[PDB]
Design a protein around this ligand. Structure first.
Ligand SMILES: [Zn+2]
Ligand SMILES: [Zn+2]
Ligand SMILES: [Zn+2]
Ligand SMILES: [Zn+2]
Lengths: 66, 48, 116, 1131
DNA sequence: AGAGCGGGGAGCCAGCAGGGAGCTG
RNA sequence: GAGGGAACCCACU
DNA sequence: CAGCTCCCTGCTGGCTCCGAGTGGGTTCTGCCGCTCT
C-alpha cells in the first residue's frame, strides 16, 4: 500500500527511499544501479524497494469521505 | 369426515375424505414413500 | 461372399426367398403383392466370422489430404509410383487384434491403398 | 519477414498482450449478457404466441419492440434516479433496469372492424443488469470517471448486484445439441444407442431428445427401435419412416443406407424391416405410434392427429418444425440410423461424453434466456387469466392491471439471489449453485470465480470419467485449477486466452452454401449421396457437396478475412466419414492459434512492429484477426488441425515428425488458468502441488480491490504491505497481479532449526512480524434495519435503557450513541453492543433485539453507514476493523503448495544469520520438499536471490528455454554468492557456524485466510439445542464438538465404557424419566407433590426413575408417535 | 378502511409368470 | 447471564 | 392318455445404502388477495 518504514529482515530504514527510488528510475537509472545509489546493499532491502507496490497513489484517487 | 359421516353425505365424498385422511396419516409417518405426491409446505419445501 | 438384398419391382419393396417345389428352384417372392422373381444366386444367408481380412473397402482415398495423418516416403505407390504416402491403422473393434498399417497414396487422383 | 527465433518470445508476448489489451479476462460473461439483452429478450418476446381471448368479441394481444432503460432507483417518493453500483451495494438494492415492451391490442366485434390500441413502452419487470456490460452505468467510463464514482477500474465486472450481494453466474457444461451421439449402453437392453438432443436454433425452447437404439442379441437379429419424445414405448424405426410418409422400401433404405453395394448395412436393417412388416401404410403407422403415446385416443382420428403433431413439432425440432419438411427430417433420421449402423458394425467409433466438442457452455446469456422464457410464459398466462376473467363478464380490461410486473422482476431476482435455477415453486427439482456469491477475498479469487465452469454432475458419483482431466481440455480449460474434495474435476476454470462463443445466425452461411454449388437435400436423388460430402450447419443436414477441398478452403478463406463467416464460426471437416459440420451456436469454447501454411507462420515482423505501437496506429488484436494471421479454433475443429507447440517445430529436423502443421500455439503457457498462472515454474512442480496452489492462491491475503474502503463486505482481508513477486510469469501482467498483489517476498531459509518447523510448519521471525511482515486487517460488516412488523412490532434504533427494555444479554450500552448506533473509533469486544434495536411488544413494553459483536472478536469500529433500504426503513451497516498480527498457527503458503502453519516465532537475535547479518523471515523444513517434489520452490528461491541482487524482476514463465537452473546458478555466482543458493548460516543461540550450508533466498509467501483465532473453540457448558437438548452447532453459537460414531467405536476398542458414558450421556444430554414398572411406558410424575401416576395401568406405587439421554426419550416418544411401544422393562 | 384472518449409481429380495415333472379319472 | 429453523453454496483437514 | 396340479427357474419391479469432522456466507419462512366497515 505504502512503502514500509523498515526492512522486514534487518530493520534498515527504507521508508525515506521510495520517492528517491522513483526519481532515480525516471532519471533512467537501472533498478540495480538505483538501488545501489540508495545504499541498499543487502538483497533483503533491495527486494523491499524492488518489489514494492505503491497502492496509496490509487487510493488517493477516491474523493475523501472524511 | 366426522361432519360428512354425521351430517350424512354420499359415498363419493366420504371415499375421498378417507383417501385424503389416509394420505395425511401416512405422510405424517412416512413422507418419502414413492408413487404418491409429497406433503409440501406453502414454501414448497417437503414436510419432515 | 456376401449376397445383396433383392427388391420388388411392382410395389417398390423388399423381396423374400422361397423355394418353389414345382420346378424345385428358388424364387424371390414379394409378400406385399403377387410379384415373383427367380434367383440368380442360391445363397440366401451368409456370414463372415474370421473373413475380416479385407479392410480396404472401408478405407476411402480422401484420407490422403488429412494434415494430421502421418506421411512417409519409404513406401511408394504401385499404381502411380509416387514417393509420398500416408500410413495409419484400422480403427474398428474388429481391428483391435491388428496394428497393420494401411497406406494411401498422397498424390491426387491416384487413390491407391495397400498394406505392408 | 519471418520472425527469427531470437525475437520470437518478444513477438508472442506482444501478440498475447494485444489480446489481453482488447478482450480482457471476463469478456465471455459480458458478451453473453450483452447478447442476451440485445437479441435474446426480444426473440423471447416475439416468439411468444399472441394472446387470442374470446369469451363474443375477440381480443388479440401482440407484443412488439422491447425497450430497456438504464439501472434506475425509485424511492418511496417515486422519483426516478440513476442507480450507481455502490449505491446498490450499500443500500442492498438490486442493480436492475426496467424493461418496457410495446403492446398492441386489437378488438374484433360482431359486424365491426378492428380497434387497435398502442400501449407504447409498457413496464413488465426489471432485468438485473450485469456490471460493466453495455447496459450498465459504468460502461464506457474511463478510470478517472470510475474513481469519481468510487468504483475500481481494475474491477472486472461480469457480475450482478442482487440485494447488495455480488452474484456471479457459473457457466454450466451441457451436452451439445443437434449432434448425433452413439454410445454403447452399459448393461442394458440396447447394445448401441444413438441420441440427438435436438433443439431449434435461436429459439429458447427445451431440447427434445430422440433416441435411435439397437437392441441386444441375448429373435433372428438386431432390431433398431426409436425412443421418440412423448411416445412412451419403443416404436420400430421402419414404422417411424412409414409414419413420415414413406410406404416403400427403397425410399426408407435410400434415406438410411446411402450406398447400395454395401451388404452389411442391409443385413443389419433386415431384422428391423422384417419385424415391422405388418405395418405398411402411413396412417396405420401413425395409429401404431399414437396408440402408445402419453395421451392415448379412443378415436383413430385423434391418434392420427397426435402422432402427426408429435412427428411434426417434437421429433427432431431442429431440422424442421413446419410442414412439407418430411424429407429433411427423414434424411436426418436416416442419418441417425446410419450412424447407429456404422457404430454397431464397428466401422465408426463411439462418441465420448467427456469430449468438449460434445459439450456446450451455458453462460449468463443462455441461462438468463431460459429463465426469461419461462417467466414471460408465466406473465402471458397471468395476463390471459386476468383478461379472460374480465371478458367473461366485464366489458373491457385495462392492460396495465393485467401486467403482473412482479413475475419477471421477482423471478429473476429469486434465481439470481438463491442460485436455485428455475422456478421457486419447484425448488427441489431446480439446479442449485448456478448463481453464487462472488468471491472477493483477493483479486485472483474474483477473476477465478468470474471465469468458472461447472459440470452438472452429482458430486457423490463414484465414476471418475467426468472428473478426469480429458485430453480435449488443452488450452480451453486450466489443467491445474480444480477444487479439492467432492468437486474435483467437476468445477473448472477457463485458460487465459480461451473464449466462449456467444452465438451467431446460421443464415449468411446458408445463402453462401446455396450459391456455392451445394445441392439441397430436397432436390437430389439419394444415389448422389454415397460419394458426396454431407454438409451440416448447426447440426442440420442441409445438403451435399462434391468438391470439399475448394469448399473448405473457400470457407476458411472467408472466415480468415472477417467476411460472411464470422470469426467464432467453427468449421470441421471429417475426411474419413465425408462430412462437413458447421457450428455457429453459442457455448462452444475456442482459443486463438497462429496459422501455419507451408511450414511458415503467417505472423510476420510487420504485425509485431504495428502491435508495438498499439496506442498510435490503432492496431489491435482484431486487426490480427482480420489479417488472416490468428484463428479461433474450438474443440471439434482442434481434432482436424495439426498444431505446432513452437515455431521451432516448423523447422526441418533430422528426424522430421510432421511437415503438415496447420496451426501453431501462440504460447503454451496459455493452457493455464488465472490462478495457475501465478505459479512460478509450474512445470518444475508436481501437478497436485499446482492444483493445491490454484486452490490456495484464492485464500491468500492481499488487497482484494482498490475501493475496499467504500465497500461494506461481510468479510474482508487487507494486507498491510503486499508486494509484487520478484519471480513473476509473463501471464501475471494480464491478471493485474502487480497492482493488486497478494503476498510478500520473504527471505526463506530451508533449514532444520529447533524442530518447530517439522511436518509442514514454518518458523517466522518475530522481529520481522513486529515491523509489519504479513500484518493485516480483518474487516467485518454487520447490517441491521428497523423492520416494521405490522402495527405492534416496531423495531427502532434507540439506545436501550434497562428501565424500559427486556430480553437483554446484560451487556453495557454505554458505547452506543443516542441514535442507537455505535460510532467509528470505539474499541469493541465480543460481548459489546454496536446496534441498539428495540421492538415494541403488545412494564417491559420494549424487548431488546440489539445486534451484538461476534464472540472473542476484538476490534475498532471502522465505519458506520446509515441509509434507507428499498422499503424505506432505516438501515445501517457497521464495519469493524481488527488488526491481525501473524501468530503461531496462522496458515502461510508459498506459490508451490507448500502450505503450513507458523509453529514458533523467534526474534532476530535468535534466528540464524548469514555473514551479512541477514536472518530469514521464514524457515521451512527440508522434509517438506522431497516427497512433494516442489522443485519450482527451490528455483524460485534461487531466481529471487538473483533478481534481488541484480535489481531485475525474474521471469518464470513455465515453458521458457532461456531460463534454466544452470543459467540462474551462474548469475548468482556472479554476485559473490554460492551458485546453488546455499549460505553459511550461524546459529543464533550460540554464534557457531551451522555445519551444513543453508539454502536461503527470497521466496514469495502469501498469508492465507485461515487464521487460528478464527478457528479456536472451546466449551464447558452453554447453549443446547431446542429439540434434542444436545449442545449447539459451531463456535459461532458456542456449540460443542461432535463425538461421532467412529469416536464411539474407538472408545469401544479402548474398553473405556465410563468415558463412553460420560461423552455420550453426561456431557451431552443427561435426563431422567419415570417409567411404569408394569407396562414400561413413561409415566406422569409430579415431583413437586411426589405424585407418580401411570395411566393405562392405574399404577401409582410402582414407578421407577430411569436415567437416559434426552435423545433416547425423544426417540422413544417419536416411536410412540409412530404407534410403536418401547416398553422399557426394568426387570 | 386499514387491520387482520384464510387458503445418479450400485446390489439384494420378493412376487408373478413361464417351464417341466407327476397324478387321476 | 441467555431467543429460530431449513435449504444451498464456498472453503478447510 | 389329456388335462389338471404342483413345485423349480427366469424376469421385473421395489427397496435401501452411498467417510469423519470443521469454519464461513446468503437466502427462504411468509404470500398474496380478500370481506367487513
Ligand atoms: Zn534489509
Ligand atoms: Zn411387391
Ligand atoms: Zn499412387
Ligand atoms: Zn404402566
Amino acid at each position: 500500500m505504502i512503502i514500509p518504514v523498515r526492512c522486514f529482515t534487518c530493520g534498515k530504514i527504507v521508508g525515506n527511499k521510495w520517492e528517491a527510488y522513483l526519481g532515480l528510475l525516471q532519471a533512467e537509472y537501472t533498478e540495480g544501479d538505483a538501488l545501489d545509489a540508495l545504499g541498499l546493499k543487502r538483497y533483503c532491502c533491495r527486494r523491499m524497494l524492488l518489489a514494492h507496490v505503491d497502492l496509496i497513489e490509487k487510493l488517493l484517487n477516491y474523493a475523501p469521505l472524511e | 369426515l366426522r361432519r360428512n359421516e354425521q351430517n350424512g353425505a354420499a359415498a363419493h365424498v366420504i371415499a375421498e375424505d378417507v383417501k385424503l385422511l389416509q394420505f395425511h396419516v401416512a405422510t405424517m409417518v412416512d413422507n418419502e414413500l414413492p408413487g404418491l405426491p409429497r406433503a409440501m409446505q406453502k414454501s414448497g419445501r417437503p414436510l419432515k | 461372399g456376401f449376397v445383396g438384398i433383392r427388391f420388388c419391382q411392382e410395389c417398390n419393396n423388399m423381396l423374400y426367398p422361397k423355394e418353389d417345389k414345382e420346378n424345385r428352384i428358388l424364387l424371390y417372392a414379394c409378400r406385399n403383392c403377387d410379384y415373383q422373381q427367380e434367383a440368380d444366386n442360391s445363397c440366401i444367408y451368409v456370414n463372415k466370422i474370421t473373413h475380416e481380412v479385407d479392410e480396404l473397402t472401408q478405407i476411402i482415398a480422401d484420407v490422403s489430404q488429412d494434415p494430421t495423418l502421418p506421411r512417409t516416403e519409404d513406401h511408394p505407390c504401385q499404381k502411380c509410383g509416387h514417393k509420398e504416402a500416408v500410413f495409419f491403422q484400422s480403427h474398428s473393434a474388429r481391428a483391435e487384434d491388428a496394428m497393420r498399417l494401411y497406406y494411401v497414396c498422397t498424390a491426387p487422383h491416384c487413390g491407391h491403398r495397400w498394406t505392408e | 519477414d519471418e520472425i527469427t527465433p531470437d525475437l520470437w518470445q518478444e513477438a508472442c508476448w506482444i501478440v498475447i498482450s494485444s489480446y489481453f489489451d482488447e478482450k480482457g479476462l471476463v469478456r465471455q460473461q459480458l458478451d453473453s449478457f450483452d447478447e442476451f439483452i440485445q437479441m435474446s429478450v426480444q426473440r423471447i418476446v416475439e416468439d411468444a404466441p399472441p394472446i387470442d381471448l374470446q369469451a363474443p368479441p375477440r381480443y388479440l394481444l401482440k407484443f412488439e419492440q422491447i425497450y430497456l432503460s438504464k439501472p434506475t432507483h425509485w424511492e418511496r417518493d417515486g422519483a426516478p434516479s440513476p442507480m450507481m453500483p455502490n449505491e446498490a451495494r450499500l443500500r442492498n438494492l438490486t442493480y436492475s433496469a426496467p424493461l418496457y415492451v410495446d403492446i398492441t391490442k386489437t378488438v374484433i366485434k360482431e359486424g365491426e372492424e378492428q380497434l387497435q390500441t398502442q400501449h407504447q413502452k409498457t413496464f413488465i419487470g426489471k432485468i438485473p443488469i450485469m456490471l460493466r456490460s453495455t447496459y450498465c452505468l459504468l460502461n464506457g467510463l474511463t478510470d478517472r470517471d470510475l474513481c469519481e464514482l468510487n468504483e475500481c477500474p481494475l474491477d472486472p465486472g461480469g457480475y450482478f448486484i442482487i440485494n447488495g450481494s455480488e452474484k456471479v453466474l457459473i457457466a454450466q457444461e451441457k451436452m451439445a445439441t443437434n449432434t448425433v451421439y452413439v454410445f454403447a449402453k452399459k448393461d442394458s437392453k440396447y447394445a448401441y444407442t444413438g441420441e440427438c438432443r435436438s433443439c431449434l436454433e435461436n429459439s429458447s425452447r427445451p431440447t427434445s431428445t430422440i433416441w435411435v437404439s439397437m437392441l441386444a442379441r441375448g429373435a433372428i437379429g438386431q432390431r433398431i427401435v426409436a425412443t421418440l419424445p412423448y411416445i412412451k414405448q419403443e416404436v420400430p424405426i421402419i414404422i417411424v419412416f412409414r409414419a413420415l410418409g414413406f410406404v416403400s422400401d427403397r425410399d426408407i433404405l435410400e434415406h438410411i443406407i446411402y450406398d447400395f453395394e454395401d451388404p452389411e448395412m442391409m443385413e443389419m436393417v433386415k431384422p428391423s424391416l422384417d419385424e415391422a412388416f405388418v405395418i405398411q401404410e402411413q396412417n396405420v403407422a401413425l395409429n401404431f405410434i399414437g396408440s402408445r403415446g402419453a395421451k392415448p385416443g379412443v378415436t383413430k382420428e385423434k391418434r392420427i392427429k397426435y402422432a402427426k403433431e408429435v412427428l411434426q413439432k417434437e421429433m427432431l425440432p431442429h431440422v424442421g418444425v413446419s410442414d412439407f419438411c418430411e424429407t429433411k427430417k427423414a434424411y436426418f433420421l436416416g442419418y441417425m440410423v446410419h450412424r447407429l449402423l456404422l457404430a454397431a458394425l464397428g466401422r465408426r467409433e463411439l462418441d465420448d461424453r467427456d469430449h468438449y466438442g460434445n459439450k456446450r457452455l451455458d453462460l449468463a446469456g443462455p441461462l438468463l434466456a431460459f429463465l426469461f422464457r419461462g417467466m414471460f410464459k408465466n406473465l402471458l398466462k397471468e395476463v390471459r387469466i386476468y383478461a379472460q376473467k374480465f371478458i367473461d363478464r366485464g366489458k373491457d380490461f385495462n392492460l396495465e392491471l393485467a401486467i403482473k410486473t412482479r413475475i419477471i422482476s421477482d423471478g429473476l431476482k429469486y434465481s439470481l439471489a438463491t442460485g436455485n435455477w428455475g422456478d421457486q415453486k419447484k425448488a427441489h427439482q431446480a439446479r442449485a449453485g448456478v448463481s453464487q456469491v462472488l468471491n472477493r477475498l483477493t483479486f485472483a479469487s474474483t477473476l477465478s470465480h468470474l471465469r468458472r465452469l461447472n459440470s452438472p454432475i452429482g458430486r457423490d458419483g463414484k465414476l471418475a470419467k467426468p472428473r478426469q482431466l480429458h485430453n480435449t481440455l488443452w488450452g480451453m480449460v486450466c489443467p491445474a485449477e480444480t477444487p479439492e474434495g467432492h468437486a474435483v474435476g467437476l468445477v473448472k476454470n477457463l485458460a487465459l486466452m480461451a473464449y466462449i462463443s456467444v452465438g451467431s445466425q446460421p443464415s449468411p452461411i446458408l445463402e453462401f452454401l446455396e450459391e456455392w454449388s451445394m445441392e439441397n437435400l430436397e432436390e437430389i436423388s439419394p444415389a448422389a449421396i454415397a460419394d458426396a460430402t454431407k454438409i451440416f450447419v448447426n447440426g442440420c443436414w442441409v445438403g451435399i457437396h462434391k468438391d470439399p477441398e475448394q469448399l473448405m478452403n473457400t470457407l476458411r478463406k472467408l472466415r480468415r478475412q472477417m467476411d460472411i463467416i464470422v470469426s467464432e464460426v467453427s468449421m470441421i471437416r471429417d475426411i474419413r466419414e465425408r462430412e462437413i459440420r458447421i457450428y455457429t451456436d453459442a457455448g462452444r469454447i475456442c482459443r486463438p492459434l497462429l496459422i501455419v501454411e507451408k511450414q511458415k507462420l503467417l505472423l510476420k515482423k510487420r504485425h509485431i512492429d504495428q502491435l508495438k505501437e498499439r496506442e498510435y496506429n490503432n492496431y489491435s488484436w482484431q486487426d490480427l484477426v482480420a489479417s488472416g494471421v490468428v484463428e479461433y479454433i474450438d474443440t471439434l475443429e482442434e481434432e482436424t488441425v495439426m498444431l505446432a507447440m513452437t515455431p521451432d517445430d516448423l523447422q526441418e529436423k533430422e528426424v522430421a515428425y510432421c511437415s503438415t502443421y496447420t496451426h501453431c500455439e501462440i504460447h503454451p503457457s496459455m493452457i493455464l488458468g488465472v490462478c495457475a498462472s501465478i505459479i512460478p515454474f509450474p512445470d518444475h512442480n508436481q501437478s497436485p502441488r499446482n492444483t493445491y496452489q490454484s486452490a490456495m492462491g484464492k485464500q491468500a491475503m492481499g488487497v482484494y480491490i482498490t475501493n475496499f474502503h467504500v465497500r461494506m463486505d461481510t468479510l474482508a482481508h487487507v494486507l498491510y504491505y503486499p508486494q509484487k513477486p520478484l519471480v513473476t510469469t509473463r501471464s501475471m501482467e494480464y491478471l493485474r497481479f502487480r497492482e493488486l498483489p497478494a503476498g510478500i517476498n520473504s527471505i526463506v531459509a530451508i533449514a532444520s532449526y529447533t524442530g518447530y518447523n517439522q511436518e509442514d510448519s514454518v518458523i517466522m521471525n518475530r522481529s520481522a512480524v513486529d515491523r509489519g511482515f504479513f500484518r493485516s486487517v480483518f474487516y467485518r460488516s454487520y447490517k441491521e434495519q428497523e423492520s416494521k412488523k405490522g402495527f405492534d412490532q416496531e423495531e427502532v434504533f434507540e439506545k436501550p435503557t434497562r428501565e424500559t427494555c427486556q430480553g437483554m444479554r446484560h451487556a453495557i450500552y454505554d458505547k452506543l450513541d443516542d441514535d442507537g448506533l455505535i460510532a467509528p473509533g470505539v474499541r469493541v469486544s465480543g460481548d459489546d453492543v454496536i446496534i441498539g434495536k428495540t421492538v415494541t411488544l403488545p412494564r417491559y413494553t420494549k424487548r431488546d433485539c440489539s445486534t451484538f459483536l461476534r464472540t472473542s472478536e476484538t476490534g475498532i469500529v471502522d465505519q458506520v453507514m446509515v441509509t434507507l433500504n428499498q422499503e424505506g426503513y432505516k438501515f445501517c451497516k457497521i464495519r469493524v476493523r481488527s488488526v491481525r498480527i501473524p501468530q503461531i498457527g496462522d496458515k502461510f503458503a508459498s506459490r508451490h503448495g507448500q502450505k503450513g502453519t507458523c509453529g514458533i516465532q523467534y526474534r532476530q537475535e535468535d534466528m540464524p544469520f548469514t555473514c551479512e547479518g541477514i536472518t530469514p523471515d521464514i524457515i521451512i523444513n527440508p522434509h517438506a520438499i522431497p516427497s512433494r517434489m516442489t522443485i519450482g520452490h527451490l528455483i524460485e528461491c534461487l531466481q529471487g536471490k538473483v533478481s534481488a541482487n541484480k535489481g531485475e524482476i525474474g521471469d518464470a514463465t513455465p515453458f521458457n528455454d532461456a531460463v534454466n537452473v544452470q543459467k540462474i546458478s551462474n548469475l548468482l555466482s556472479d554476485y559473490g554468492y554460492h551458485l546453488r543458493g546455499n549460505e553459511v548460516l550461524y546459529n543464533g543461540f550460540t554464534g557457531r557456524k551451522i555445519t551444513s550450508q543453508i539454502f536461503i533466498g527470497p521466496t514469495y509467501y502469501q498469508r492465507l485466510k485461515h487464521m487460528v483465532d478464527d478457528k479456536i473453540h472451546s466449551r464447558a457448558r452453554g447453549p443446547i439445542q431446542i429439540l434434542n437438548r444436545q449442545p449447539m452447532e459451531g463456535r459461532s453459537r458456542d456449540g460443542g464438538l461432535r463425538f461421532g460414531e467412529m469416536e464411539r467405536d474407538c472408545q469401544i476398542a479402548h474398553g473405556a465404557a465410563q468415558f463412553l458414558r460420560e461423552r455420550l450421556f453426561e456431557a451431552s444430554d443427561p435426563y431422567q424419566v419415570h417409567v411404569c414398572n408394569l407396562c414400561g411406558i413413561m409415566a406422569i410424575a409430579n415431583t413437586r407433590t411426589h405424585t407418580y401416576e401411570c395411566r393405562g395401568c392405574r399404577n401409582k406405587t410402582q414407578i421407577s426413575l430411569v436415567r437416559m439421554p434426552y435423545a433416547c426419550k425423544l426417540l422413544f416418544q417419536e416411536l410412540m408417535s409412530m404407534s410403536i411401544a418401547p416398553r422399557m422393562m426394568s426387570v
